[PDB]
Amino acid sequence: GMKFSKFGQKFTQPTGISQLMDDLGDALKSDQPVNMLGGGNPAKIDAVNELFLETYKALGNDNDTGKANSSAIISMANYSNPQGDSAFIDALVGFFNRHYDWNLTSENIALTNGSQNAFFYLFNLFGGAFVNEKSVDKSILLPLTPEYIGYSDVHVEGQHFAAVLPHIDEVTHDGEEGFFKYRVDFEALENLPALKEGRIGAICCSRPTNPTGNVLTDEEMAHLAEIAKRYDIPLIIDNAYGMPFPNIIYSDAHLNWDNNTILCFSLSKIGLPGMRTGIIVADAKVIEAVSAMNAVVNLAPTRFGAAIATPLVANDRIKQLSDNEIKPFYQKQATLAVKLLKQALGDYPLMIHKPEGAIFLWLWFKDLPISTLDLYERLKAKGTLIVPSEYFFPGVDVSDYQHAHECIRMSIAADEQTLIDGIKVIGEVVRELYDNK
Amino acid sequence: GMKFSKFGQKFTQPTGISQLMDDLGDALKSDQPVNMLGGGNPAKIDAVNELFLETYKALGNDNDTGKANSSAIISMANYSNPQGDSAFIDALVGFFNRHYDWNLTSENIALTNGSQNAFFYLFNLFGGAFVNEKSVDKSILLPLTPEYIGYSDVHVEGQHFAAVLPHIDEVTHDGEEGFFKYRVDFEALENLPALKEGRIGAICCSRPTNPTGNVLTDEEMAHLAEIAKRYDIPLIIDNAYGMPFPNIIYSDAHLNWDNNTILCFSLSKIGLPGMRTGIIVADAKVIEAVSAMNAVVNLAPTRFGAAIATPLVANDRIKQLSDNEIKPFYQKQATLAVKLLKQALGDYPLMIHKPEGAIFLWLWFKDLPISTLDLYERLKAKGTLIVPSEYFFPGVDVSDYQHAHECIRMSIAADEQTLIDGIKVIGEVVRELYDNK
Numbered sequence: 001g002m003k004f005s006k007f008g009q010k011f012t013q014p015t016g017i018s019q020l021m022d023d024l025g026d027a028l029k030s031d032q033p034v035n036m037l038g039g040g041n042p043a044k045i046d047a048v049n050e051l052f053l054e055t056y057k058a059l060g061n062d063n064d065t066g067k068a069n070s071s072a073i074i075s076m077a078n079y080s081n082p083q084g085d086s087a088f089i090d091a092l093v094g095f096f097n098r099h100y101d102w103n104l105t106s107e108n109i110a111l112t113n114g115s116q117n118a119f120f121y122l123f124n125l126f127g128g129a130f131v132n133e134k135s136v137d138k139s140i141l142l143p144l145t146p147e148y149i150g151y152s153d154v155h156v157e158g159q160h161f162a163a164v165l166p167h168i169d170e171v172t173h174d175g176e177e178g179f180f181k182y183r184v185d186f187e188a189l190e191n192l193p194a195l196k197e198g199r200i201g202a203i204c205c206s207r208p209t210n211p212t213g214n215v216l217t218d219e220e221m222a223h224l225a226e227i228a229k230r231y232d233i234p235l236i237i238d239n240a241y242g243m244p245f246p247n248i249i250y251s252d253a254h255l256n257w258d259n260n261t262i263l264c265f266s267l268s269k270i271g272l273p274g275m276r277t278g279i280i281v282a283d284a285k286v287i288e289a290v291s292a293m294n295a296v297v298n299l300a301p302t303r304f305g306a307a308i309a310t311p312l313v314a315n316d317r318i319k320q321l322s323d324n325e326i327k328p329f330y331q332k333q334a335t336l337a338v339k340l341l342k343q344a345l346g347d348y349p350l351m352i353h354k355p356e357g358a359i360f361l362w363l364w365f366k367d368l369p370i371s372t373l374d375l376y377e378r379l380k381a382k383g384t385l386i387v388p389s390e391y392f393f394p395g396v397d398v399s400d401y402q403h404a405h406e407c408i409r410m411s412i413a414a415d416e417q418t419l420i421d422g423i424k425v426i427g428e429v430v431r432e433l434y435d436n437k
Numbered sequence: 438g439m440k441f442s443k444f445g446q447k448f449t450q451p452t453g454i455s456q457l458m459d460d461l462g463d464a465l466k467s468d469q470p471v472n473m474l475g476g477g478n479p480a481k482i483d484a485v486n487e488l489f490l491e492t493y494k495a496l497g498n499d500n501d502t503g504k505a506n507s508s509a510i511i512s513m514a515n516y517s518n519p520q521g522d523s524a525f526i527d528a529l530v531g532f533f534n535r536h537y538d539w540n541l542t543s544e545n546i547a548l549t550n551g552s553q554n555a556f557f558y559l560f561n562l563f564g565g566a567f568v569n570e571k572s573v574d575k576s577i578l579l580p581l582t583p584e585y586i587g588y589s590d591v592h593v594e595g596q597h598f599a600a601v602l603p604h605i606d607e608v609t610h611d612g613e614e615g616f617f618k619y620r621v622d623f624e625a626l627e628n629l630p631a632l633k634e635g636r637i638g639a640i641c642c643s644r645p646t647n648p649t650g651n652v653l654t655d656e657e658m659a660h661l662a663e664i665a666k667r668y669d670i671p672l673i674i675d676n677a678y679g680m681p682f683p684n685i686i687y688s689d690a691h692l693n694w695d696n697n698t699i700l701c702f703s704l705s706k707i708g709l710p711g712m713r714t715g716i717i718v719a720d721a722k723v724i725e726a727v728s729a730m731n732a733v734v735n736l737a738p739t740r741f742g743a744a745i746a747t748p749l750v751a752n753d754r755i756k757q758l759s760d761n762e763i764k765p766f767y768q769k770q771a772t773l774a775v776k777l778l779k780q781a782l783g784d785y786p787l788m789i790h791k792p793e794g795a796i797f798l799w800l801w802f803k804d805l806p807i808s809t810l811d812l813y814e815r816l817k818a819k820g821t822l823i824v825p826s827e828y829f830f831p832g833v834d835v836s837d838y839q840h841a842h843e844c845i846r847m848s849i850a851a852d853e854q855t856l857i858d859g860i861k862v863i864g865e866v867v868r869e870l871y872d873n874k
């Protein structure tokens with residue numbers, strides 16, 4: 001009746017991620033109450049919203065006497081340049097140069113409709129079909145998996161990711177056992193054939209990581225920069241939950257840049273996800289590409305998130321908000337979740353990834369009699385929503401890797417009572433599964 | 438250095454449109470002042486901004502006592518569904534059903550990051566490579582050109598437009614001659630080999646049209662709807678400037694819809710272009726596609742435009758604003774511009790397209806000794822910026838198309854003094870050209 005192109009058939013195709021996203025969106029839009037521990041929406045932090053309401057009001061009250069011209073109206077009533085809101089870009093240049101001495105200019109920053117829009121651009125700019133120097137497909141290299149589920153399907157044709165599986169070390173957290181950290185396997189990575197065949201167009205990772213809450217160490221990051229410069233490809237770093245804002249990082253870490261680094265940031269995780277504002281810091285050549293892409297796909301990127309954020313970047317309040325209100329909120333939430341998980345399981349073979357950042361806990365059930373896609377169904381049936389591990393391994397076949405079927409992602413951004421009720425159910429279901437064969 | 442994919446090379450490649458867009462972006466950002474008649478930004482209408490400012494304040498002042506839980510905060514602090522802001526869609530459902538009785542449900546409406554985002558989806562959804570019935574390219578049929586410059590480059594691979602040239606009839610405007618109206622050449626369109634052979638994926642047009650100000654007639658639209666139904670392809674209609682908002686239409690027309698129609702609206706031309714809100718009314722099948730694409734490309738679309746517009750849709754003030762303030766503002770500006778053009782030229786071979794809508798005047802210099810691309814360069818060097826006609830014929834080889842080198846687009850959204858100064862220079866330069874061989 002209505003014929004779509006090959007392009008349309010790819011976005012119309014059912015997938016494991018597409019079915020899962022339908023289920024998350026169905027509960028959010030439904031009457032049946034649920035224990036929502038499966039989304040990525042930030043927490044409702046009161047001190048944060050009080051600052052945003054003040055900034056909002058101020059933008060509508062700075063007009064000249066008896067005249068329409070408030071900042072709120074100017075931002076609404078006009079298209080930004082395709083590269084993004086000029087004032088916000090200038091504010092960002094000043095901010096980054098004050099705090100890190102990178103010597104940026106406005107040519108080094110672009111805005112997109114959320115970081116997701118930035119990955120849609122960046123992964124189709126450095127992956128997919130390249131001219132053979134007669135056509136050669138190159139991949140985005142994820143040096144460590146599990147990694148962000150949202151990367152998976154952004155390519156315009158086929159799928160173009162290469163991943164290296166991680167080394168697992170059992171570690172300690174707050175004086176107790178039953179924790180672990182994923183580490184980059186440089187033996188596997190440095191010897192990766194795709195890299196020597198010239199089939200890798202970029203390296204990319206999130207810091208801290210969705211879904212694990214893992215923070216790749218400064219030594220791991222410096223090593224990745226060497227590999228990136230060696231193979232003459234950019235190192236893309238997704239700071240959605242990281243420095244300098246919202247700075248939801250609990251372990252020692254430093255933010256760096258050079259002309260070979262592409263740094264992505266967002267306003268979603270400081271509490272402005274409805275605004276859809278991503279920020280890219282890169283070499284002039286990358287910013288030009290993104291700006292041209294915005295011109296064609298979007299005309300101009302959105303600017304209301306840039307309007308609220310601008311004065312908060314100018315006076316460093318965006319940093320104070322992050323360090324004083326956002327970071328502590330999520331740490332107390334993660335500590336409470338760990339406490340409750342250890343009360344439910346703890347005698348059982350549950351491992352919790354060292355919570356070093358972001359808004360999630362990553363739970364690993366060693367030798368569980370069912371897969372975590374199965375646990376996901378059983379928990380959804382009882383009103384508790386979590387995300388199963390098998391969709392966080394883009395670029396690697398996990399049908400033959402059992403660790404990929406033994407974990408779940410749980411949001412610690414949910415309110416206290418949701419965490420209490422959700423973890424109670426997770427405990428009952430899982431204990432009952434371990435107690436029988 | 439940095440090496441890009443083929444997809445990327447399409448956006449690095451300087452086209453005629455990217456070089457024109459750079460000159461228009463440079464003129465704005467420059468210290469040198471200019472008579473800016475080349476943009477597409479809507480006018481600053483005081484009555485519109487007063488209503489917007491009131492709405493903005495109201496959304497931030499409906500919090501419960503001593504709390505920051507206002508509508509503005511809720512809208513900022515949460516991702517919408519990938520299909521778009523639920524409340525805004527429900528308001529739109531009610532609104533269209535009140536005014537047109539199309540029996541829509543929420544399944545028929547999706548939101549995008551401006552209508553440009555809608556065209557990037559729709560033209561790639563129904564154009565480019567299709568599975569053959571080993572594969573076959575299909576095009577988006579533009580039943581009459583000139584058409585919107587922004588459609589040109591949205592295809593992911595190559596360019597897939599089949600454009601039909603117009604018939605021209607001399608018409609009158611306000612008791613005066615020196616006007617014309619483009620009309621659909623149904624002989625040429627209905628016999629196009631691509632159409633007969635099944636190589637056209639959809640039909641598309643703007644109503645009113647950028648850059649001409651032309652409104653395709655009710656009879657012309659009915660015919661296109663039959664042709665579309667016959668060939669199992671949808672009719673996409675861009676109402677950026679049309680009914681019911683901003684309703685910048687000065688001639689008799691009807692807004693119609695059915696399941697084979699894809700109606701695109703926008704909040705940009707009512708005065709909120711900075712917010713980036715596109716609206717699509719279509720069959721469920723098309724909306725699901727858009728939703729799935731938003732999920733991958735954007736996570737969710739922007740919502741602050743939705744937040745402002747929701748109450749103005751609920752109480753029909755969006756319609757009253759359009760009819761009482763926006764529509765009359767532009768008619769008086771177009772009238773003023775025509776007056777001024779007839780004082781400058783008028784004795785000369787200037788034809789003006791009958792201004793039936795949108796925010797531009799389309800000027801045709803019969804037998805101009807230079808090309809309008811050349812006129813553009815001369816005016817640019819004397820501080821006045823307009824847009825040359827050769828970029829408004831997507832998919833047409835304009836290298837030996839006389840008519841495509843004889844017109845200019847002029848914005849009548851500019852303030853009065855810009856129109857007086859600009860037209861004065863346009864008059865001097867053009868008269869001087871006609872006066873010598």
Ligand SMILES: Cc1ncc(COP(=O)(O)O)c(C=O)c1O
Nearest residue numbers: 040114115116206210240266268
């Ligand atoms: C690691 C990570 N990066 C990027 C994003 C996308 O964020 P946005 O497009 O809202 O900026 C998400 C959000 O879920 C995420 O978890």
Ligand SMILES: Cc1ncc(COP(=O)(O)O)c(C=O)c1O
Nearest residue numbers: 299551552553643647677703705
């Ligand atoms: C006819 C037409 N359609 C659509 C658009 C795009 O509007 P939006 O701001 O909604 O992306 C424009 C240009 O701004 C236009 O002139």
